[PDB]
Design a protein around this ligand. Structure first.
Ligand SMILES: [Ca+2]
Ligand SMILES: [Ca+2]
Ligand SMILES: [Ca+2]
Ligand SMILES: [Ca+2]
Length: 393
């Protein structure tokens, strides 16, 4: 009962947190090279709690002379599942991906991706002097933005965690909606292909420099990559293999139920969609003052159909992703600061009362005190950072 209030409010706060962040693959045109630039952020869960961030900068240039499509600013959204082959002795990765383009509200090479295309991947790498090779094969179905691939480390033991290689290991398989067909540089550069260059900064650790050639060889789409890693800590999350491999399908029906409870705090008229006005209302009642522009930006970050609203499914998707990948300490501390309005490091009854009252949740002072009780571990009559965290898991 009180836990439900903590989780509902918590989920609402973390939802605004997510809508404030930039979690997609952001693509912009680069006229100087008739290609595109991209930038994005990857969250890698750390085995025993915590998250390792990987910041990506990306550049793509066509290989051929033929005309290509230069996109308006937009993004790709990616869902990955990593798994193992039960009958594989070798160090390997089974990878399933769904990639979809969005971010804009409501070519010849494209023809090559109408059906299922075979894929081959070859990677030679060197990180802090630890050399390795990866070879992968599978297929892509751009109609659904689907990729399915199996990768083998052909030199024995992979000296870095599989998850860190994923973004390096064919964005031409992304699904562009009809109203965005003209923004698909990747397919447009086919069959001759493109060079794709990245630098990937692992926070508080080393970096990768990758150069890859993505093109058709016969009927097969082939990605050939070289990767150099430097400045890695030998006992860090990467070289020390401290990153989790997979996340669960989870979503205990109770979790979805909680997501829905959070959703209905935003959807105050119960039409199954959240507007800029609704998102705004909640944000203000939490003590923020975003402008209409910002509201539109936040919605566009998750607005799959481009209708300018967050509908219930889009919200569920957003929350499922937010539940998969852990938040940084700073993010949790900001969430905390939403309650800890004086910044003293402690959530007092008066503060929790201010929040719940402004939120519209009408309860008695005794109910507030009960919430504090449910949260209070050490018994000081307040909620501190650590208690907050242990509450929001
Ligand atoms: Ca609504
Ligand atoms: Ca929508
Ligand atoms: Ca306080
Ligand atoms: Ca306490």
């Amino acid at each position: 009962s009180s836990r439900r209030k903590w989780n509902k409010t918590g989920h609402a706060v973390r939802a605004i947190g997510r809508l404030s962040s930039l979690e997609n693959v952001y693509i912009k045109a680069d006229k100087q090279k008739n290609g595109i630039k991209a930038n994005f952020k990857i969250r890698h869960n750390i085995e025993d709690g915590g998250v390792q961030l990987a910041y990506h900068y990306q550049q793509n240039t066509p290989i051929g002379d033929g005309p290509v499509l230069l996109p308006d600013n937009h993004y790709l959204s990616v869902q990955s599942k990593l798994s193992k082959d039960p009958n594989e002795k070798r160090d390997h990765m089974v990878l399933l991906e769904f990639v979809t383009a969005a971010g804009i509200t409501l070519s010849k090479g494209e023809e090559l991706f109408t059906g299922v295309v075979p894929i081959l991947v070859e990677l030679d790498g060197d990180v802090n002097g630890h050399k390795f090779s990866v070879s992968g094969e599978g297929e892509g179905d751009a109609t659904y933005g689907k990729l399915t691939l199996k990768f083998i480390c052909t030199t024995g033991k992979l000296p870095v965690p599989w998850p860190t290689l994923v973004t390096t290991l064919v964005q031409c398989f992304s699904r562009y909606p009809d109203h965005m067909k003209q923004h698909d540089f990747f397919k447009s550069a086919m069959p001759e292909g493109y060079i794709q260059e990245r630098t990937i900064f692992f926070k508080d650790d080393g970096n990768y420099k990758t150069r890859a050639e993505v093109k058709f060889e016969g009927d097969t789409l082939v990605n050939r990559i070289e990767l150099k890693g430097i400045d890695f800590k030998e006992d860090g999350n990467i070289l020390g293999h401290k990153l989790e491999y997979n996340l669960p399908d989870q979503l205990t029906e109770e979790q979805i139920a909680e997501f829905k409870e959070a959703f209905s705090l935003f959807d105050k008229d119960g039409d199954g969609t959240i507007t800029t006005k609704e998102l705004g209302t909640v944000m203000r009642s939490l003590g923020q003052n975003p402008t209409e522009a910002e509201l539109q930006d936040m919605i566009n970050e998750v607005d799959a159909d481009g209708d300018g609203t967050i509908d219930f499914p889009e919200f569920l998707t957003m929350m499922a992703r937010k539940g998969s990948y852990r938040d940084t300490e700073e993010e949790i501390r900001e969430a905390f600061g939403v309650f800890d309005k004086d910044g003293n490091g402690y959530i007092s009854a008066a503060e929790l009362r201010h929040v719940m009252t402004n939120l519209g949740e009408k309860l008695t002072d005794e109910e507030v005190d009960e919430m504090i009780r449910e949260a209070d571990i050490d018994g000081d009559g307040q909620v501190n950072y650590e208690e907050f965290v242990q509450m929001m898991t």
